[PDB]
Design a protein around this nucleic acid. Structure first.
Ligand SMILES: [Mg+2]
Ligand SMILES: [Mg+2]
Lengths: 200, 264, 126, 230
RNA sequence: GGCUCUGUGGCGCAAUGGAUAGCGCAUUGGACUUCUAGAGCAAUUCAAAGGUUGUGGGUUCGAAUCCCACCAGAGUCG
């Protein structure tokens, strides 16, 4: 019941009451000062997972399936990321887009940690046998850089994995219903200092 | 074929006698802060000369231990072990195995000891210089160079490195290691690293669960996928897994632990 | 404020790149003019590179500076960087300084980061 | 000319005089992978052998500085009966100094104490001792290294910082490394997120990132990449 | 039941040379760099403190060192 505009391939909310609600609802979206830009993940999350947000286009409401189609076309990864954005949101985190570093999401607990996130995630969908194509190729140089920069900022690199069964064909990804049949697997990646780790 | 025919350096009696008077204090490197820009000063030249001269003084020293403390080891080429000839010292609490009533060491253990000067490795009745030991022990048939580097790096700290012998959902790393064990090839666990505090009462017979389990791999090698990591963390069991990375003599360690999100 | 802006006339008249590209360009223009508060900005187009460049001026006499907006989706090969460097050199036309342009990475969250790619060797200033 | 022991693709320098020659004349630092005789159990500072990057070995070989030579086979058994008269004759002389000073000594030499003949190898063809020949990554990294060496720099491994060559304006003993030079082919697509991570790390360490690339005609172009706070 | 090998700073060790205890990690402190207090791995660097040398006995101008006994620990041979 919150009107927005999908103008120029981005969701923007104009109404003052709506943006006040969205900032009071766990700090969703980034402003200017004051229209509120809302990322595709947060927009589709408030359209489907809660239903509070209503996105209109061409003076008519859009079915969530059409929203999924448009967001997938305008952002190929939006499927995978959204699933992760759901998986870290049901558990009370505040996943903000975190490409200030080489990672995707920054997870925060609540209000007292104002943007003081303590985790940085690397989303990549994988298969049932864990032989999926790399959404973002990795190497020990890249992982070392990511770990060092995350330690300098006092965070902990994550490696979230989304597992899709073989029975779930990709063509069904048209709806978030496939989210009901996607497993998850989180892997922290921290350095092991051989000097310090001598018991205690 | 043209041959360079190089030659080494042998110490004289005075040099051998004075080598055992060395103090263990290290020469400090870089002498504090390092200058940002090479402005061609007449003072930076003297600092560079002093630092490099101290480096050459430190690199010109050789190990000289008395014959009493040197265990007369003996490398066996075909067998693959380093069967000693005298009773072993303190290093026998945590290193080497016993077989046929005779003490015997693995290639990497004996090479680390020889580099440390604990033993005196022979070969075909000819004592081996550390260079010959490096050429002879490290190979694909035995411990490789990276594995030995990780081994020595951990041993010099006090570790007891042994040799290893065999709405959405939320899975875990050990969840599935039977259908995944058949698909092998690549990273494999090598070392059962214990901790330094366990040196005091280590039992090489029933040592308990190792502190970690090292996988050694180069820094240019591909990063393992979820399949290889899951297989390795199933083989490792409850014992945490650690990946050791070597880039041209520098060693780093990274651990891929499982995690579960607290319910905020 | 967003839809009704005079610069959007030239933004549409350029007709270079996708609507997302011109939108992130307008977002960077608004970021630089409102918060960063530069003296002047412009929307120059590069049809050959299919890019939008923002030729701004931080101080009233500091001189022309170039900012290139790109989303996180865009792929930058080193050839692309060299081409952008040469285009920036042509725009500034100042052989007294090496090729140099600021790359403005922008996310759908409308969060913006910058990196000053300069040709040659640049010592990290204290 | 100097000699470098190349076994299984590993290039090592045993004699300390060669290490001094490399550091002083040719400015090719290297890293030490052995253990110090002075202090055996530590990691703060190491000793001989010196380990050379394959790019350093190829560069040194090509400029006619060190003669790369493969390690010899174990056929030294026949040359014996000389060390027995060597260790025992010194023992008789050694009791003379120790008695006037108021059980024998043994030297664990780091380098081989005997003159040995070993055949050389050509690095321009791939084999079981120089496998780096023909690898595109080795070709790219050596192409970057040669040009960052001609201009005058000291280069060292930089995997800990995510780069490929820490580059310093002088000797690493007395000058902090300036660049974290990477090595990207002209056509390879650089990941923007990895670039952001590397740039932020460079600013943290205070070491400008370099996107070194060799052009098809043959020339290394460098594109420095700093933070751009506005 | 014998045999062999060990016991030194919180942890791993050196001093075997008979002239009295030092090295690294850990801890504490200083300097520098960076980040939003924290972090620092050739952007890092320096300095300090830290001791029933397992216990008793004996040789000796002196015992951590050499010898014996004991206590504890590890391995091995029944
Ligand atoms: Mg004690
Ligand atoms: Mg102790």
């Amino acid at each position: 019941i919150f009107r927005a505009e999908m103008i120029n391939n981005n969701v923007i909310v104009r109404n003052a009451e709506d943006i006040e609600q969205l900032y009071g609802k766990g700090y969703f979206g980034k402003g200017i000062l004051e229209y509120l830009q809302l990322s595709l993940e947060e927009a589709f999350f408030l359209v489907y997972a809660l239903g509070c947000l209503s996105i209109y286009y061409e003076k008519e409401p859009l079915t969530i399936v059409k929203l999924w189609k448009a967001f997938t076309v305008v952002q190929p990864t939006f499927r995978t990321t959204y699933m992760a954005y759901h998986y870290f949101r049901s558990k009370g985190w505040v996943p903000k887009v975190g490409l200030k570093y080489g990672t995707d999401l920054l997870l925060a607990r609540k209000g007292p940690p104002f943007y003081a996130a303590s985790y940085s995630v690397i989303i990549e969908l994988v298969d049932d046998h864990f032989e999926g194509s790399l959404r973002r190729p990795l190497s020990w140089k890249s992982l070392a850089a990511l770990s060092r920069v995350s330690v300098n900022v006092s965070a902990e690199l994550m490696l979230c994995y989304l597992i899709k069964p073989s029975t779930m064909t990709d063509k069904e990804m048209e709806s978030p219903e496939c989210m009901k049949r996607i497993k998850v697997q989180e892997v922290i990646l921290s350095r092991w200092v051989s000097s310090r780790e001598r018991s205690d | 074929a043209a041959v360079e025919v190089p030659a080494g350096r042998v110490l004289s009696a005075r040099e051998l006698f004075a080598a055992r008077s060395r103090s263990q204090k290290l020469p400090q490197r870089s002498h504090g802060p390092k200058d940002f820009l090479p402005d061609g000063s007449a003072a930076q030249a003297e600092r560079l000369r002093r630092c490099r001269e101290e480096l050459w003084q430190l690199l010109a020293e050789q190990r000289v231990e008395r014959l009493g403390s040197l265990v007369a080891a003996e490398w066996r080429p075909e067998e693959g072990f380093v069967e000693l000839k005298s009773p072993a010292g303190k290093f026998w609490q945590t290193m080497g195995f016993s077989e046929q009533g005779r003490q015997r060491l693995h290639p990497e253990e004996a090479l680390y000891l020889l580099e440390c000067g604990s033993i005196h490795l022979f070969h075909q009745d000819l004592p081996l210089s550390i260079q010959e030991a490096y050429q002879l022990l490290l190979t694909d048939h035995t411990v490789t160079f990276l594995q030995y580097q990780v081994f020595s790096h951990l041993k010099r700290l006090g570790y007891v490195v042994r040799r290893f012998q065999p709405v959405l959902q939320t899975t875990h790393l050990p969840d599935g290691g039977a259908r995944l064990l058949e698909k092998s090839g690549g990273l494999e666990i090598i070392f059962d690293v214990y901790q330094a505090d366990a040196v005091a009462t280590f039992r090489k017979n029933n040592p308990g669960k190792p502190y970690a389990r090292m996988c050694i791999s180069g820094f240019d090698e591909p990063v393992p996928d979820l399949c290889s990591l899951k297989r390795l963390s199933y083989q490792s069991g409850d014992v945490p897994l650690i990946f050791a990375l070597v880039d041209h003599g520098d060693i780093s360690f990274y651990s891929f632990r499982d995690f579960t999100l607290p319910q905020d | 404020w967003m839809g009704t802006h005079p610069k959007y006339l030239e933004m549409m008249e350029l007709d270079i790149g996708d609507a997302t590209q011109v939108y992130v360009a307008f977002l960077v223009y608004l970021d630089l003019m409102e918060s960063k508060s530069w003296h002047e900005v412009n929307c120059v187009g590069l049809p050959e590179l299919q890019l939008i460049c923002l030729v701004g001026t931080e101080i009233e006499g500091e001189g022309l500076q170039t900012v290139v907006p790109t989303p996180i989706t865009a792929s930058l090969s080193h050839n692309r960087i060299r081409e952008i460097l040469k285009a920036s050199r042509k725009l500034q036309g100042d052989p007294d300084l090496p090729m140099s342009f600021t790359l403005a990475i922008v996310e759908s969250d409308s969060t913006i980061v910058y990196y000053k790619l300069t040709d040659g060797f640049m010592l990290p200033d204290p | 000319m100097l000699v470098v022991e190349v076994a299984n693709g590993r290039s090592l320098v045993w004699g300390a005089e060669a290490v001094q020659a490399l550091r002083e004349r040719l400015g090719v630092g290297g890293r030490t992978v052995g253990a110090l005789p002075r202090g055996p159990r530590q990691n703060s500072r190491l000793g001989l052998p010196l380990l050379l990057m394959p790019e350093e070995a190829r560069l040194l070989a090509e400029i006619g500085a060190v003669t790369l030579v493969s390690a010899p086979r174990p056929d030294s058994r026949h040359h014996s009966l000389a060390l027995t008269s060597f260790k025992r004759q010194q023992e008789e002389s050694f009791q003379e100094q120790s008695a006037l000073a108021a059980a024998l000594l043994v030297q664990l030499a780091t380098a081989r104490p005997r003159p040995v003949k070993a055949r050389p190898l050509d690095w321009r063809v791939q084999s079981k001792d120089w496998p780096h020949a023909g690898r595109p990554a080795h070709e790219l990294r050596y192409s970057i290294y040669r040009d960052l060496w001609e201009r005058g720099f000291f280069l060292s491994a930089a995997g800990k910082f995510g780069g490929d060559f820490l580059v310093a304006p002088g000797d690493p003993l007395r000058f902090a490394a300036h660049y974290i030079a990477q090595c990207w082919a002209p056509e390879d697509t650089i990941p923007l997120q990895d670039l952001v991570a590397a740039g932020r790390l460079g600013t943290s360490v205070r070491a400008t990132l370099l996107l070194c690339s060799p052009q098809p005609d043959g020339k290394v172009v460098y594109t420095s990449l700093q933070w751009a706070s506005l």
